[PDB]
Amino acid sequence: VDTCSLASPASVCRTKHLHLRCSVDFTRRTLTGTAALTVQSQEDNLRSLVLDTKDLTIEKVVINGQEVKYALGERQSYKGSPMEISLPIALSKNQEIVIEISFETSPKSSALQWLTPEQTSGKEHPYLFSQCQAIHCRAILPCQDTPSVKLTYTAEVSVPKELVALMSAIRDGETPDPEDPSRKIYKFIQKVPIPCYLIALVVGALESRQIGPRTLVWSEKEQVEKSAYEFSETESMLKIAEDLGGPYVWGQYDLLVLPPSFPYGGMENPCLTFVTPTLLAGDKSLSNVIAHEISHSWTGNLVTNKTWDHFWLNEGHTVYLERHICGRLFGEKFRHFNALGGWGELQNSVKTFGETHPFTKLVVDLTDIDPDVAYSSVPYEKGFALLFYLEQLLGGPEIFLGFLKAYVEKFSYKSITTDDWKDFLYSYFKDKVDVLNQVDWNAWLYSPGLPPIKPNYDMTLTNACIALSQRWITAKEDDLNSFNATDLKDLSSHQLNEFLAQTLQRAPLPLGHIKRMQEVYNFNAINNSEIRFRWLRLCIQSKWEDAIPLALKMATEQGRMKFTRPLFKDLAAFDKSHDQAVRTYQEHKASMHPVTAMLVGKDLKVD
Ligand SMILES: c1ccc(Oc2ccc(-c3cnc[nH]3)cc2)cc1
Ligand SMILES: [Yb+3]
Ligand SMILES: [Yb+3]
Ligand SMILES: [Zn+2]
Numbered sequence: 001v002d003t004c005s006l007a008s009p010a011s012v013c014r015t016k017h018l019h020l021r022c023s024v025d026f027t028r029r030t031l032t033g034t035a036a037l038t039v040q041s042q043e044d045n046l047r048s049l050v051l052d053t054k055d056l057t058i059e060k061v062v063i064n065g066q067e068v069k070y071a072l073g074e075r076q077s078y079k080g081s082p083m084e085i086s087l088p089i090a091l092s093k094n095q096e097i098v099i100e101i102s103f104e105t106s107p108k109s110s111a112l113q114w115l116t117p118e119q120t121s122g123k124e125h126p127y128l129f130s131q132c133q134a135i136h137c138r139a140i141l142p143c144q145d146t147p148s149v150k151l152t153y154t155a156e157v158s159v160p161k162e163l164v165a166l167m168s169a170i171r172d173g174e175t176p177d178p179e180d181p182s183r184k185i186y187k188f189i190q191k192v193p194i195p196c197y198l199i200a201l202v203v204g205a206l207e208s209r210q211i212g213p214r215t216l217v218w219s220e221k222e223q224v225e226k227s228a229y230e231f232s233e234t235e236s237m238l239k240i241a242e243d244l245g246g247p248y249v250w251g252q253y254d255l256l257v258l259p260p261s262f263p264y265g266g267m268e269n270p271c272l273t274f275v276t277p278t279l280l281a282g283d284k285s286l287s288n289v290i291a292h293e294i295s296h297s298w299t300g301n302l303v304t305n306k307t308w309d310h311f312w313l314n315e316g317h318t319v320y321l322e323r324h325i326c327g328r329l330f331g332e333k334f335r336h337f338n339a340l341g342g343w344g345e346l347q348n349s350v351k352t353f354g355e356t357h358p359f360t361k362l363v364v365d366l367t368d369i370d371p372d373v374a375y376s377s378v379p380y381e382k383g384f385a386l387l388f389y390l391e392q393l394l395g396g397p398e399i400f401l402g403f404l405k406a407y408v409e410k411f412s413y414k415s416i417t418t419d420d421w422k423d424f425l426y427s428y429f430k431d432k433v434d435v436l437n438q439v440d441w442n443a444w445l446y447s448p449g450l451p452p453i454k455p456n457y458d459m460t461l462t463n464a465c466i467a468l469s470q471r472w473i474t475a476k477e478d479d480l481n482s483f484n485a486t487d488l489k490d491l492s493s494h495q496l497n498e499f500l501a502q503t504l505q506r507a508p509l510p511l512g513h514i515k516r517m518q519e520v521y522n523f524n525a526i527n528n529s530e531i532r533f534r535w536l537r538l539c540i541q542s543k544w545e546d547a548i549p550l551a552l553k554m555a556t557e558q559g560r561m562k563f564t565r566p567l568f569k570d571l572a573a574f575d576k577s578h579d580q581a582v583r584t585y586q587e588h589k590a591s592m593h594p595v596t597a598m599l600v601g602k603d604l605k606v607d
Contacts, residue, residue: 002307003367004135006073006082007144008049014040015144015151015196016096023158023183024165024203026126029107029114031201035141036100038151041091048087052138052145054080055106062100063088078110078370080138101142111136113261113593120204120259121220125163127204129258129274131267131595134308134371137196148306148415150193158185159203166218168200168269170251192249192270193413195304200269202256212253214238219257219277226280227257233284233329237291240328244321244401245298245408253294261559261593265289268296268318276560278529285493285528288326288338295321303411308371310417312362316383317404323384324401334494336458339388341498343454346381348505353378355449362386362445363418372595373602375561382451386444389455390425393435403428418445465495469502472513480516488521493528500534507541514542524550533563540570540577548577556588559596569603582606 002009015037022033039049053072061070069086076082085099107114115127130140138145157165158177161184169190177183208216209228212235217227234255242248254272257280266289267274273293279286299317319342327335353360359374362382366374391400406428411420422441429436443452468487475483488496503509518524523535536554539547548571555567571581585604589597601607 002146002148003365004079004308004371005052005144005146006050006076006079007052007146010144010146010148011042013042013046013049013144014149016040017151018141018143018153018155018196018199020141020153020155020157022155024128024160026114026128026160031105031109031112031140032103034100034102035143036098037143038096038098040096041093043091044093046087046091046095049085051083051085051101051142052080052135053083053103053142054078054136054139055109056139056142057104057106058083058142059102059104061085062102063097078372079135083142103142105140108594109136109139110594110598111139115204115259115261119261119591121222122205125205127220127259128202129204129262130199130201131263131274131593132197132199133267134197134311136595137199140199140201143196145196146307147195147197147304150195150304150413150415152193153188153190153199155188156185157188157201157203158183160184162205163203164206165201165203166206166254166256166272167202168194168198168272170271190270194270194301195415198268198270198301200267200272200274202258202272202274206256208254211235211255212238214248214251214253216252216254217257218254218272220259223257223277223280226282227255230280230282230284231255231275231287231290233287234290234294236329237287237294237325240325241291241294241297241321244324244405245295246405248297249302250297253297255290260557261591261596263559263561263593263596265560265562266293268293268300270297270301276558278558278560278563281493281528283493283528286530288322291325292318292322295325298408302413303408304415306415306417306420308366309364311364311371312379312383313416313418313421315379316387317407319380319384320387321404324397333458333460337461337494337498339384339455340457340459340462341501342381342384343457344501344505345377346385347450349377349381350450352376357448360448372599385451385455389451389453390439392455393439394429394432461495462498464491465498465502468499469506472503472509472517473506475513477512480512483516483520485520485522493531497528497531497534500531500538504534504538504541507538509538509542511542511544514539514544529558529560529563533567537566537570540567540574543574543576545576548574548580552577552580552584556584559593561596561599564596565600565603568600572604 017038019036022031061068071084073082111130117123120127159165165186167188169188172187172189174186177185206218207221207224208218209224211217211228215234219227250270252271256274257277262276265276295318300314305311305313323335323338350360440452526532536551540551551567555564571577
């Protein structure tokens with residue numbers, strides 16, 4: 001039972017294939033076309049079925065060349081409206097039919113962001129991008145919008161000829177549009193069965209540069225060169241991931257660097273990972289996001305969560321693999337450093353939500369909950385902590401990686417629950433069941449708050465961050481002169497970020513301390529988005545008025561939710577910037593990504 005979907009479940013019927021034929025209309029801000037769904041009946045005498053839709057305009061439904069009856073139910077908030085389709089003939093079990101739905105998206109589709117030329121790098125062309133995870137595919141096309149159903153797809157997308165279209169699929173050619181010479185049709189093929197949240201589309205003035213044997217980086221021309229350098233470790237990370245998870249089955253691994261309003265750090269769209277331009281630090285320091293997206297090619301894209309209640313399966317295992325890739329490239333001491341950092345991020349999420357909050361549970365119950373509202377570090381970090389705890393309990397990383405590879409092999413091309421995962425863990429580790437029976441499963445999986453046990457972490461790389469953070473926290477006015485730029489000479493950008501995170505956990509600090517920190521460290525000059533984000537939060541929470549224009553600029557010049565949401569919340573909580581935070585949000589609301597706009601609105605209590 002997928003409580004986030006209004007469609008017929010996989011026990012009734014299953015979509016096997018989607019053939020999408022659409023046109024991108026920038027003037028109307030609509031995608032117009034036909035979604036031809038190959039549906040297989042799982043029941044005898046099947047006469048109707050239900051699909052998910054959200055703000056879609058349906059023109060007609062054609063089956064076997066004839067128009068059929070359909071009805072749209074009442075809208076159920078963020079779940080959208082169920083579409084019931086009357087089949088022209090009753091279907092036997094395993095019988096297939098093609099249902100061709102003519103539709104148009106709304107300009108306010110929650111899956112899409114339409115950008116005017118002014119909102120892009122080049123300033124001459126418009127731009128469009130999609131983001132389906134978790135339940136926004138229904139706001140693009142009618143579908144069984146549930147990760148419990150996997151389908152292949154083909155697509156033909158008509159766009160203005162001066163633009164390029166890309167999808168989460170293999171590029172299958174381009175031709176002039178035979179119905180409009182001012183347009184081009186780009187073709188796509190996704191031969192590997194995927195859940196529909198993995199369907200993705202981008203249309204804009206895109207250029208590409210090859211960075212590996214199976215990787216192109218795509219972006220507007222202005223970002224191509226910086227992107228090619230930033231993500232140069234991609235091929236080496238793909239090779240390590242294959243060693244850990246088995247063959248890469250997707251063919252190509254391309255990267256698309258989106259405009260700054262992209263709401264997430266990355267999105268694992270198959271064949272075409274989408275990334276935030278906030279990774280463009282100039283030193284490859286934020287490349288763990290690429291390692292994370294690459295890992296999803298196994299954990300999430302091959303083995304998928306059956307419902308959103310089991311999303312931790314996707315994230316926990318991906319973070320676990322991501323940390324091993326970075327560990328193979330930079331050492332085991334670095335893997336422990338990132339892991340311990342992740343525990344800190346989990347402490348933060350638990351503190352923010354509250355230790356009894358249901359969203360702090362590993363397995364959640366999303367009935368009547370908008371998944372976008374539940375989104376946090378919890379499934380990532382509590383999921384990772386569980387796996388890291390199990391690794392230590394079970395004999396170490398080599399042993400636990402053996403389980404991960406077998407797990408991916410066992411469940412490839414399937415959608416699974418937490419019970420399916422636990423059963424296989426027990427089956428794989430049959431000779432260690434007595435060890436497994438010591439795990440407090442009810443607490444780990446179903447209880448809110450911090451996990452019952454904290455794993456063991458090597459402290460080598462963390463020690464200098466903790467030492468410097470503690471020097472600042474315990475410093476009195478007569479100690480401020482003892483700080484100097486030399487305090488940072490032996491710290492990597494990762495350690496600098498960790499020093500800020502540690503200090504931020506004890507914020508506010510006195511205003512004189514924060515002013516001294518700028519004087520000696522010149523943190524205002526740092527472009528690295530992670531570091532700048534934590535430094536600006538530290539300044540605002542410490543009531544430094546000078547930081548207000550810097551924090552407002554970062555919150556609005558980019559839209560990665562991880563940065564924009566806490567920056568707006570900190571600015572709203574500071575009396576000196578409260579009014580400016582609310583006004584800036586209201587002024588930018590129309591230009592923002594629809595999900596980000598909704599979430600920042602809720603955070604600020606501005607309707
Ligand atoms: C993007 C948007 C929403 C989404 O849905 C969620 C979010 C959080 C959980 C969750 C699990 N434990 C605690 N929170 C589960 C599902 C996933 C991706
Ligand atoms: Yb081809
Ligand atoms: Yb003193
Ligand atoms: Zn992920």
